[PDB]
Amino acid sequence: VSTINSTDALAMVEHSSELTLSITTPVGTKFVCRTPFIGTHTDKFLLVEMPKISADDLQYFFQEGFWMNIRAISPRGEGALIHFRSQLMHILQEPVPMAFLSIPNTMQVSQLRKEPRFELNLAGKVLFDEHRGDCELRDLSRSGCRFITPPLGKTYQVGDLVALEIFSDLRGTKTFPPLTGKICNLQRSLHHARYGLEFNEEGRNNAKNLLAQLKFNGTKLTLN
């Protein structure tokens, strides 16, 4: 792991992303919860939304002065795991429930992935048994990828073997050879279902060729 200044570290974290708060009371009792990162006020405070927890834990584990270990994630490229200690300084209910946490001078950062994931937005179809539904590739690596599907579309579970046919252009006809792999992770949202995939040998060869046709436009990878 590496130690870097808090301004630079937090700059790697997208606002609204999820933070993992591990709180340790004065007696030693631990408590972990998740909550959205709002942002920072100057160099004085780290702002987060009040955790979606019980009103009992909320006032027995979430009190001013209590310390906690916070984990944040930087999604781009090889990604990064960010860890640091912070003290709960202030709690407000109005105009909206939120917490002000202290910002240490430095934070620890560690590599999250073996290789980088490249962002993109490529429409395609996902194959699974008799199903063939719409999907969009959101990121691609040499070993895997991320794709999303409609909330009402067929769902997959970790371990399922699927294949993605990515359109080579807007015609919605011709596609790159199948990207085959197993679902490794998933996360349902209100606007779509997300899946992480790890390619089998054939998938890796086809991904390699697809990456070879993509160009970086300063923001993400794009097709011709």
Ligand X SMILES: Nc1nc2c(ncn2[C@@H]2O[C@@H]3COP(=O)(O)O[C@H]4[C@@H](O)[C@H](n5cnc6c(=O)[nH]c(N)nc65)O[C@@H]4COP(=O)(O)O[C@H]3[C@H]2O)c(=O)[nH]1
Sorted by sequence, the CB contacts under 8 Å of residue 53 that are 6+ apart come out as 33, 61, 62
Give me the least distance between CB of 71 and ligand X, in Å please. 8
Q: HSE (CB half, 13 Å, CA atoms) of 81?
A: 10
How far is the C-alpha of 5 from the C-alpha of 95, rounded, in Å? 31
Binding of a second copy at residue 36 (CB under 8 A)?
A: yes
Of 4, 58, 89, 161, which lies in the binding site for a second copy, with binding defined by CB under 8 A? 89
Give the number of other Cβ atoms within 10 Å of residue 21's Cβ: 21
Binding mask 68-87 for ligand X (x = CB under 6 A): -----x-x---x--------
Task: Select from ligand X, a second copy, none the partner in contact with residue 73, using the beta carbon and a kind-dependent cut-off of 5 to 8 Å.
Answer: ligand X
Binding of ligand X at residue 112 (CB under 6 A)?
A: yes
How far is the C-alpha of 37 from the C-alpha of 47, rounded, in Å? 7
**Residue 57 has which token pair?**
């834990």
User: Closer to ligand X at the Cβ: 2 or 59?
Assistant: 2
Residue count of the chain, please give it.
Answer: 224
Give me the least distance between CB of 92 and ligand X, in Å please. 27
Binding of ligand X at residue 141 (CB under 6 A)?
A: yes
Stretch that binds a second copy, among 91-99, 104-112, 155-163, 177-185 (CB under 8 A): 91-99
